Enzyme design. Structure first.
Site, PDB file in Angstrom:
ATOM      1  N   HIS A   1       0.811  -1.213   0.000  1.00  0.00           N
ATOM      2  CA  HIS A   1       0.000   0.000   0.000  1.00  0.00           C
ATOM      3  C   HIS A   1       0.846   1.266   0.000  1.00  0.00           C
ATOM      4  CE1 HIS A   1      -4.180  -1.602   1.487  1.00  0.00           C
ATOM      5  NE2 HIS A   1      -3.933  -1.881   0.221  1.00  0.00           N
TER       6      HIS A   1
ATOM      7  N   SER B   1      -0.267  -0.243  -6.604  1.00  0.00           N
ATOM      8  CA  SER B   1      -0.266  -1.412  -7.470  1.00  0.00           C
ATOM      9  C   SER B   1       0.311  -1.078  -8.846  1.00  0.00           C
ATOM     10  CB  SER B   1      -1.685  -1.961  -7.615  1.00  0.00           C
ATOM     11  OG  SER B   1      -1.685  -3.210  -8.279  1.00  0.00           O
TER      12      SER B   1
ATOM     13  N   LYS C   1     -15.986  -5.976  -9.912  1.00  0.00           N
ATOM     14  CA  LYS C   1     -15.105  -6.802 -10.730  1.00  0.00           C
ATOM     15  C   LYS C   1     -14.585  -7.995  -9.939  1.00  0.00           C
ATOM     16  CE  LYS C   1     -11.032  -6.545 -13.626  1.00  0.00           C
ATOM     17  NZ  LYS C   1     -11.551  -7.329 -14.777  1.00  0.00           N
ATOM     18  N   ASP C   2     -14.165  -7.769  -8.692  1.00  0.00           N
ATOM     19  CA  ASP C   2     -13.709  -8.878  -7.862  1.00  0.00           C
ATOM     20  C   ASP C   2     -14.864  -9.790  -7.478  1.00  0.00           C
ATOM     21  OD1 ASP C   2     -11.119  -7.887  -7.976  1.00  0.00           O
ATOM     22  OD2 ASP C   2     -11.320  -6.751  -6.111  1.00  0.00           O
TER      23      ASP C   2
ATOM     24  N   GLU D   1       1.469 -34.823  -4.314  1.00  0.00           N
ATOM     25  CA  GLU D   1       0.269 -34.245  -4.893  1.00  0.00           C
ATOM     26  C   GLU D   1       0.622 -33.422  -6.129  1.00  0.00           C
ATOM     27  OE1 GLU D   1      -2.747 -34.146  -5.106  1.00  0.00           O
ATOM     28  OE2 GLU D   1      -3.699 -35.023  -3.335  1.00  0.00           O
TER      29      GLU D   1
END
Ligand SMILES: CCCCCCCCCCCCCCCCCC(=O)OC[C@H](COP(=O)([O-])OCC(O)COP(=O)([O-])OC[C@@H](COC(=O)CCCCCCCCCCCCCCCCC)OC(=O)CCCCCCCCCCCCCCCCC)OC(=O)CCCCCCCCCCCCCCCCC
Ligand SMILES: CCCCCCCCCCCCCCCCCC(=O)OC[C@H](COP(=O)([O-])OCC(O)COP(=O)([O-])OC[C@@H](COC(=O)CCCCCCCCCCCCCCCCC)OC(=O)CCCCCCCCCCCCCCCCC)OC(=O)CCCCCCCCCCCCCCCCC
Ligand SMILES: COC1=C(OC)C(=O)C(C/C=C(/C)CC/C=C(\C)CC/C=C(\C)CC/C=C(\C)CC/C=C(/C)CC/C=C(\C)CC/C=C(\C)CC/C=C(/C)CC/C=C(\C)CCC=C(C)C)=C(C)C1=O
Ligand SMILES: COC1=C(OC)C(=O)C(C/C=C(\C)CC/C=C(/C)CC/C=C(\C)CC/C=C(\C)CC/C=C(/C)CC/C=C(\C)CC/C=C(/C)CC/C=C(\C)CC/C=C(\C)CCC=C(C)C)=C(C)C1=O
Ligand SMILES: COC1=C(OC)C(=O)C(C/C=C(\C)CC/C=C(/C)CC/C=C(\C)CC/C=C(\C)CC/C=C(\C)CC/C=C(\C)CC/C=C(\C)CC/C=C(\C)CC/C=C(\C)CCC=C(C)C)=C(C)C1=O
Ligand SMILES: CCCCCCCCCCCCCCCCC[C@@H](O)O[C@H](CO[C@H](O)CCCCCCCCCCCCCCC)COP(=O)(O)OCC[N+](C)(C)C
Ligand SMILES: CCCCCCCC/C=C\CCCCCCCC(=O)OC[C@H](COP(=O)(O)OCCN)OC(=O)CCCCCCC/C=C\CCCCCCCC
Ligand code: HEC
Ligand code: HEM
Ligand code: HEM
Lengths: 62, 81, 73, 379, 241
Positions: free
Chosen positions: D201, D205, D227-228, D271
C-alpha cells in the site's frame, strides 16, 4: 418493450429502498419454492423408474 | 503522492463521460465486440502456440517410447534355447 | 428347470463368439496360436504368450462393450 | 458534519485499505487473483474448522473418523470435498499470482516480493501436513519419504528427523503433532498476508504497461468491488463443478485404503501441486545434492530482481522475453508430467534435461536476451 | 509383470453426467452380498440402516437385521451375551482378526469392500472385468495350485477362486441368475457403498448449473453497467497554443 410496466414497478417499489428490500424478500421466498419444485421435477423425469420414490409403492403397505 | 489531490501535475486535458442509465450495457457486441477479440487472439498466436505444440510432441513421443520398452523382443530366446 | 444350460444361457457367450469374426479379433488369434506353438516345440525357452493374449482380449472387450447391455434386463 | 469513515479509527483503516485507495484503471483480470487467494484462505479455514469438530488425530481412529464424517455426519461429504478441492484451487491461484509478477515485473517491489516468498513456503507446509491427516496409504508413505530426506544433512540430519518424528518411525505422535501445526499455521499466514498488503500500500499497485499510472488512478470501491465479485462468482463456479460432478479426479486413489506400514505401494507420488519439485530432486544422483537443488530452485525466485537487467519493467514490449517465458512455462508442465511417471530411462533423461533447462533459462538466457533487446533499441 | 491390462469403459446406467443409480439393481446387488460376499469379505463402514430410504423399507430392514445374531456387552456376572441384532448394528465380521482371515484364505487377505470401488483404478469397470475374466493359463506360465490366473489382476495370479457362476442364487424379483447379471448388480451395490451421496450430489449439481446460468449473465451485465462510464469516455488535449 413494456416501458409502462417497468415505469410502474419503479414508481411503486423501487424509488424507496425499504420497499426495494421487501420485494426482494418476497421474491426469493416465491422463487425458491418454484425453483426447487421445478428442478426436482426435472430430476425425477430424467431418472424415471429408478428412484426409490418410484418403486416404494411396490413394498410399502405391501 | 499517496492520496487523491496530491498525486501528479496535469494540465490541458478534457474528459467526457455519460451516465450509466443513459447508455447501453452491450453496445455493438457483435459488430465491434467480436472483431476485437479475434484481433487479440491472432496478435498473440504464434508467440505461444509453438511451445505448447512442442510439449505435445515430447509427451506423445515419450509415452510411446515407454510402451515399446515393455514390448516383447524377438531377440528373446531367438536361439531357441 | 426345463434346461440347466439353455435357460441359463449368458448373453456374454453369444456376444463373445459373435465378435470373434473380425479381422482384428482374428488376425491376433493366429499370432497368439503361432506364439503358443513356438513354446510347445522349444524345450528350453522361458517365454510365454501373455503379452500376445493382452492384445486379443483388448480388441475383443472393446467391441463387446457397445453390444452387451442391449441384451440385458 | 464530515463522513464518519474518515474519523473513526477502525473506519480509517477500512477506508484506506478497501474503499478509497487509488488503483490503476487498466489492471486486467490477472490482478484479480490476489483477492481470490484470500477468499480461498477464508473458505479453507471455515470448512476445515467444521471438519475439526469431528476429526480424531490418532493412528487408529483417524481413518475411521473420516469415514464417519463422509457418511453419518450431515453434509460431511460436501464439506470434506470443498476443503480438499479448495486446496487445489488455492495453489492454482497462487501459481497464477506468482506468474503475473514475473511477466509484468511486479518483483521490482522488493519488500512486497520477498514477503510473498515466505507466504508461499508457509502455504506449502500447511498443505503438506494436511495431506497426512487422512492417514491413508499414500499419506503415510508420502510423509515417510519427504521426511527421511533430511538424513542427508551433514551431521545433524539423523538427529533432526527422529526429533520431528517423536520416535524411531512415523506413528500417532507425528499425526497429532502435524494436526496442531496444520491448525495453527494458516492463521500465521493470515497475519503475514496483512504485511503483504501493508508494504504494497505504501507504493501502489502496478499496471500491465509498466508505466506509472498516477495520471489515471481510480477509487477502488465501485469498479473493482464488482469486478472482484465477478471473479469470485467464477471461482465458485469452478470449485462447485469440481466437487459436485467429479470430486475425485484431482486426487489420487489408493488413499482410500488404511495405511499399512509393512506395504510399500509400487508408485509413490506427491500431490499434483508438488510434483514439479519431486522430479527436480529425483533426477540429481546425490541425495544431498537433490535437496540442495530443490532449495536453490525455490530461492531463485528471490534472486529474480537481481538478474533483471532490462530497461523496461513489463515484458509486454519484449517479444523475445515472452517466448522464453512461455518456454519456461512449458518446461514446468514437462516437470509436472514426469513427476507422475515411474522411474525409467526415457523419463529420467527427460527430467534431467528439463531440470538443467529450467535453471539455465532463469540464470543465463533471460539476462542475455534482455541485454540484446536493450542493444536493439539503442538505449 | 507387464503393463496392467486396462479394463474397457462399459456403459453404466449411472455414468451419465446427470444419471442416477438404479435402486432395484442395488437391492439385488445387496442380496448377492449376503450369500457369496459375506462369507469372507468385510464391510466395516455400512450399518443395517442406510437402506431404509434407498432400497429396503424400514420394516423390511428390521426383519433382515434381526436374522443374524450379534455380540453384546456384559451381564450381571460380566459375561457377554448375543443379541438378535438391531438396525444400528454393522455387518458382521467374517473373522475376528486379520491373522485368522489369512490363515483361512491361504495367506491372502480379502480387503474390506466399503471403499474398494474408489480405491482401485478403473472403478467398477475393473471389478466387473475382474469377476467375468478367469482365463485358462497361457502356455509357458505356471502358478501355485492355490493361485488363479486372472489377467486384470496386477499380479496375474489371484488367490480368490471364481466367486460366481450361473444359478448361485435366485433373486426375489425373479430375474434370471445369469453370471453377467449378478456381476453387474453387485458392482452397482459396491458403487453405492462407496458413494452414498451420489444421487443427492448430482441433484445439487443440476440446481447449481441452472442457478449459475441465470446469475452469471446478470452479474456481468451489472459490471458492464457500472463500467460503461469509462468504456465510452472520450479525451481531448487542448494546449494553450
Ligand atoms: C467464463 C464464462 C463467463 C465469462 C464472463 C466474462 C465474459 C467477457 C466477454 O465475453 O466479453 C464480451 C465480448 C467482447 O469483449 P470486449 O468488450 O471486446 O473486451 C472485454 C473482455 O471480453 C472481457 O473483459 P472483462 O474485464 O469483463 O473480464 C471478464 C472476464 C473474462 O475472462 C474470463 O472469462 C476468465 C477466464 C475463465 C476463468 C473462469 C472459468 C470458470 C468456469 O475476466 C475476469 O473477470 C476473470 C476474473 C478471474 C476469474 C478466475 C476464476 C477461476 C479461478 O463479446 C463478444 O464480442 C463475444 C466474443 C467471444 C470470444 C470468446 C473468445 C474465447 C477465446
Ligand atoms: C483487526 C486487528 C486490527 C489491528 C490494527 C493494527 C494496525 C494499526 C494501524 O495501522 O494504525 C492504527 C494506529 C494509529 O494509526 P497509524 O499508525 O497512523 O496508521 C493508520 C493508517 O491508516 C495505516 O495506513 P494503511 O491503511 O495504508 O495500512 C494498512 C494496514 C494497516 O496496518 C496493518 O494492518 C498491518 C499489521 C500487521 C500485523 C501482522 C504483523 C506480524 C506478521 O493494513 C493493511 O495492509 C490492509 C489489511 C486488510 C484488512 C483490513 C481490515 C480492517 C478492519 O496505530 C496503532 O498504534 C495501533 C496499534 C495496534 C496493534 C498494537 C500491537 C501491540 C503488540
Ligand atoms: C516431492 O516432495 C516434496 C514436496 O511434495 C510432497 C514438497 O511440497 C516440498 C516443500 C516443503 C514443504 C512442506 C516442506 C518445507 C517447509 C519449509 C522450508 C519451511 C519450514 C517452516 C515451517 C512450518 C514454519 C514456517 C515459518 C513461519 C511463520 C515463520 C515466519 C513468521 C513471521 C511473522 C514472518 C515475519 C518476517 C518478518 C519481519 C521479516 C520482514 C521482511 C521481509 C520479507 C523482507 C525481505 C528481507 C531480506 C534480506 C530479503 C531481501 C534481499 C535483497 C536485495 C537481496 C536479494 C536476495 C538474494 C537471495 C539474491 C519438498 C521440499 C519436497 O521434497
Ligand atoms: C484487488 O483489490 C483488492 C486489494 O487491494 C486493493 C486488497 O487489499 C484486498 C484485501 C485482501 C484480502 C481478503 C486477501 C486476504 C487478506 C486480509 C487482511 C484478511 C486475512 C484473513 C484473516 C485473519 C482470516 C479471517 C477469518 C476467517 C475464516 C474466519 C475464522 C474466524 C472466526 C470468528 C470466524 C467465525 C466462525 C464461527 C461463528 C463458528 C461457526 C459456529 C457457529 C454458530 C456456532 C458457534 C458457537 C459458539 C462460540 C458457542 C459458544 C458457547 C459458549 C461459552 C457456551 C455459553 C453457555 C452459557 C450457558 C453462557 C481485496 C479483497 C481486493 O480485492
Ligand atoms: C503498560 O504499558 C503498555 C502498553 O500501553 C501503554 C501497550 O500497549 C503494550 C503493547 C504490547 C502488549 C500487551 C504486548 C502483547 C500484545 C498483544 C495483542 C498480545 C498478542 C499475543 C500474540 C500473537 C501471541 C504470541 C504467541 C503465539 C502464536 C505463539 C508463538 C509460538 C508459536 C507458533 C510456535 C513457535 C515454535 C515453537 C515452540 C517450536 C516448536 C516447533 C518446531 C520446530 C516445528 C516442528 C516442525 C514442523 C511444522 C514441520 C515443518 C516442516 C515440515 C513437514 C517438512 C520440512 C521438509 C522436509 C524435507 C522434512 C505494552 C507491552 C505495555 O507495557
Ligand atoms: C454469507 C455468505 C455470503 C456469500 C456471498 C457470495 C456472493 C458471490 C457473488 C457476488 C455477487 C455480487 C453482486 C451482488 C449484488 C449485485 C447488485 C448490487 O451490487 O447492487 C447494490 C445492492 O444494493 C442493495 O440492493 C441496496 C438495498 C439493500 C437490500 C438488502 C436486501 C437484504 C435481503 C436479505 C435480508 C436477510 C435478513 C435476515 C434476517 C434474519 C446497489 O444497487 P442499486 O441499484 O445501485 O441501489 C439503488 C437503490 N434504489 C433502488 C432504492 C434506488
Ligand atoms: C507450476 C506449473 C504451472 C503449469 C501451468 C502452465 C499454464 C497454463 C496457462 C498459462 C496461461 C494461459 C493464459 C494466457 C494465454 C496467453 O498467452 O494470453 C496472451 C497474453 C499476452 O498478452 P500481453 O503481452 O500481456 O498484452 C496484453 C494486451 N495486448 O498472455 C499474458 O498476458 C500472460 C501474463 C501472465 C499470466 C500468467 C501466465 C501463466 C503462468 C504460469 C506459470 C508462470 C510461472 C510460475 C513460476 C512459479 C511456479 C511455482
Ligand atoms: C474366500 C474366497 C473369496 C470369495 C468367494 C470372494 N472373495 Fe474377494 N478376495 C478373496 C481373497 C483371498 C482376495 C485376495 C486374493 C489376492 O490378493 O491374491 C480377494 C480380493 C478381492 C478384491 C481385490 C481386487 C484387487 O484388485 O485388489 C476384490 C475387489 C474382491 N475380492 C471382491 C469380491 C467380490 C465382488 C466377490 C463376490 C462374492 C468376492 N470378492 C468373493 C476372497 C474371496
Ligand atoms: C499466499 C497468499 C497471498 C495473498 C492473499 C496475496 C495478496 C495480494 C493482493 C490482494 C495483492 C494486490 C491485488 C493483486 O495483486 O491481485 C497482491 C499483490 C502482489 N503480490 Fe501477493 N498475495 C499472496 C502471495 C504472494 C506470493 C506467493 C507472491 C510471490 C511473488 C506475491 C507477490 C505479490 C506482488 C509482487 C504483488 C504486487 C502486485 C503489483 O504491484 O501489481 N504474493 N498480493
Ligand atoms: C490455506 C489453508 C488450508 C489448506 C491449504 C489446507 C489443506 C488441506 C488438505 C490438502 C487436506 C487434505 C484433505 C484430503 O486429502 O482429503 C486437509 C485436511 C484437513 N484439514 Fe485443511 N487446510 C487448510 C486449513 C485448515 C484449517 C484452518 C483447519 C482447521 C481449523 C483444517 C483442518 C483440516 C482437517 C480436519 C483435515 C482432515 C480432512 C480429511 O482428512 O479429509 N485445515 N487440509
Amino acid at each position: 418493450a413494456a416501458a409502462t410496466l417497468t415505469s410502474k414497478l419503479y414508481s411503486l417499489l423501487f424509488r424507496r429502498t425499504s420497499t426495494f428490500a421487501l420485494t426482494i424478500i418476497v421474491g426469493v421466498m416465491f422463487f425458491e419454492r418454484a425453483f426447487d419444485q421445478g428442478a426436482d421435477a426435472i430430476y425425477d423425469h430424467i431418472n424415471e423408474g429408478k428412484l426409490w420414490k418410484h418403486i416404494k409403492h411396490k413394498y410399502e403397505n405391501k | 503522492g499517496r492520496e487523491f489531490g496530491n498525486l501528479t501535475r496535469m494540465r490541458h486535458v478534457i474528459s467526457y463521460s455519460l451516465s450509466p442509465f443513459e447508455q447501453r450495457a452491450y453496445p455493438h457486441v457483435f459488430t465491434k465486440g467480436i472483431p476485437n477479440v479475434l484481433r487479440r487472439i491472432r496478435e498473440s498466436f504464434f508467440r505461444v502456440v509453438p511451445q505448447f505444440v512442442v510439449f505435445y510432441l515430447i509427451y506423445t513421443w515419450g509415452t510411446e517410447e515407454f510402451e515399446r520398452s515393455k514390448r516383447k523382443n524377438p531377440a528373446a530366446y531367438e536361439n531357441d534355447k | 428347470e426345463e434346461e440347466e444350460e439353455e435357460e441359463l444361457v449368458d448373453p456374454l457367450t453369444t456376444v463373445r463368439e459373435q465378435c470373434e469374426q473380425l479381422e482384428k479379433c482374428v488376425k491376433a488369434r493366429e499370432r497368439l496360436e503361432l506364439c503358443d506353438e513356438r513354446v510347445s516345440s522349444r524345450s528350453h525357452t522361458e517365454e510365454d504368450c501373455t503379452e500376445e493374449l493382452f492384445d486379443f482380449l483388448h480388441a475383443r472387450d472393446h467391441c463387446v462393450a457397445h453390444k452387451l447391455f442391449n441384451n440385458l434386463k | 458534519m464530515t463522513p464518519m469513515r474518515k474519523t473513526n479509527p477502525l473506519m480509517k483503516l477500512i477506508n484506506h485499505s478497501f474503499i478509497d485507495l487509488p488503483t490503476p484503471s487498466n489492471i486486467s483480470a490477472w490482478w484479480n487473483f490476489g483477492s481470490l487467494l484470500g477468499a480461498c484462505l477464508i473458505l479453507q479455514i471455515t470448512t476445515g474448522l467444521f471438519l475439526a469438530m469431528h476429526y480424531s488425530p490418532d493412528a487408529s481412529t483417524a481413518f475411521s473418523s473420516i469415514a464417519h464424517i463422509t457418511r453419518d455426519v450431515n453434509y460431511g461429504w460436501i464439506i470434506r470435498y470443498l476443503h480438499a478441492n479448495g486446496a487445489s484451487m488455492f495453489f492454482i491461484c497462487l501459481f497464477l499470482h506468482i506468474g503475473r509478477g514475473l511477466y509484468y515485473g511486479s518483483f521490482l517491489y522488493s519488500e512486497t516480493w520477498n514477503i510473498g516468498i515466505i507466504l508461499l513456503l508457509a502455504t506449502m507446509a500447511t498443505a503438506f501436513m494436511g495431506y497426512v491427516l487422512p492417514w491413508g496409504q499414500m499419506s503415510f508413505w508420502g510423509a515417510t519419504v519427504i521426511t527421511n530426506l533430511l538424513s542427508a544433512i551433514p551431521y545433524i540430519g539423523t538427529d533432526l528427523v527422529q526429533w520431528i518424528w517423536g520416535g524411531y518411525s512415523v506413528d500417532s505422535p507425528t499425526l497429532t503433532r502435524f494436526f496442531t501445526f496444520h491448525f495453527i499455521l494458516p492463521f500465521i499466514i493470515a497475519a503475514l498476508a496483512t504485511l503483504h498488503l501493508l508494504f504494497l500500500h505504501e507504493t501502489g499497485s502496478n499496471n500491465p504497461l509498466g508505466i506509472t499510472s498516477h495520471s489515471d488512478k481510480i477509487t477502488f470501491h465501485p469498479y473493482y468491488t464488482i469486478k472482484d465479485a465477478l471473479g469470485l462468482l467464477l471461482f465458485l463456479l469452478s470449485l462447485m463443478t469440481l466437487t459436485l460432478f467429479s470430486p475425485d479426479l484431482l486426487g489420487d486413489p489408493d488413499n482410500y485404503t488404511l495405511a499399512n506400514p509393512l506395504n510399500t505401494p509400487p508408485h509413490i507420488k506427491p500431490e499434483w501441486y508438488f510434483l514439479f519439485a519431486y522430479t527436480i530432486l529425483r533426477s540429481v544422483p546425490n541425495k544431498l545434492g537433490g535437496v540442495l537443488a530443490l532449495l536453490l530452485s525455490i530461492l531463485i525466485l528471490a534472486m529474480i530482481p537481481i538478474l533483471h537487467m532490462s530497461k523496461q519493467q513489463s515484458m509486454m514490449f519484449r517479444p523475445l522475453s515472452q517466448s522464453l517465458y512461455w518456454l519456461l512455462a512449458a518446461d514446468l508442465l514437462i516437470l509436472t508430467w514426469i513427476g507422475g511417471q515411474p522411474v525409467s530411462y526415457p523419463f529420467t533423461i527427460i527430467g534431467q534435461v528439463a531440470s538443467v533447462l529450467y535453471f539455465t533459462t532463469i540464470l543465463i538466457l533471460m539476462p542475455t536476451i534482455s541485454l540484446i533487446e536493450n542493444k536493439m533499441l539503442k538505449w | 509383470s507387464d503393463l496392467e491390462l486396462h479394463p474397457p469403459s462399459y456403459p453404466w446406467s449411472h455414468r451419465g453426467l446427470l444419471s442416477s443409480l438404479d435402486h432395484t439393481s442395488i437391492r439385488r446387488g445387496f442380496q448377492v452380498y449376503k450369500q457369496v460376499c459375506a462369507s469372507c469379505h468385510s464391510m466395516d463402514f455400512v450399518a443395517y440402516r442406510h437402506l431404509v430410504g434407498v432400497c429396503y423399507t424400514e420394516d423390511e430392514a428390521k426383519e433382515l437385521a434381526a436374522e443374524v445374531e450379534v455380540q453384546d456387552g456384559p451381564n450381571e456376572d460380566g459375561e457377554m451375551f448375543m443379541r438378535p441384532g438391531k438396525l444400528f448394528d454393522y455387518f458382521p465380521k467374517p473373522y475376528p482378526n486379520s491373522e485368522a482371515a489369512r490363515a483361512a484364505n491361504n495367506g491372502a487377505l480379502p480387503p474390506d469392500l466399503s471403499y474398494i470401488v474408489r480405491a482401485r483404478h478403473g472403478g467398477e469397470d475393473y471389478v466387473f472385468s475382474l469377476l467375468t475374466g478367469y482365463c485358462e493359463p497361457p502356455t509357458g506360465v505356471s502358478l501355485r495350485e492355490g493361485l488363479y490366473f486372472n489377467p486384470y489382476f496386477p499380479g496375474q495370479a489371484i488367490a480368490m477362486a471364481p466367486p460366481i457362476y450361473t444359478d448361485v442364487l435366485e433373486f426375489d424379483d425373479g430375474t434370471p441368475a445369469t453370471m453377467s447379471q449378478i456381476a453387474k448388480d453387485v458392482c452397482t451395490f459396491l458403487r453405492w457403498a462407496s458413494e452414498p451421496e451420489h444421487d443427492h450430489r448430482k441433484r445439487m449439481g443440476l440446481k447449481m448449473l441452472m442457478m449459475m446460468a441465470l446469475l452469471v449473465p446478470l452479474v456481468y451485465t451489472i459490471k458492464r453497467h457500472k463500467w460503461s462510464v469509462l468504456k465510452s469516455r472520450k479525451l481531448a488535449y487542448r494546449p494553450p497554443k
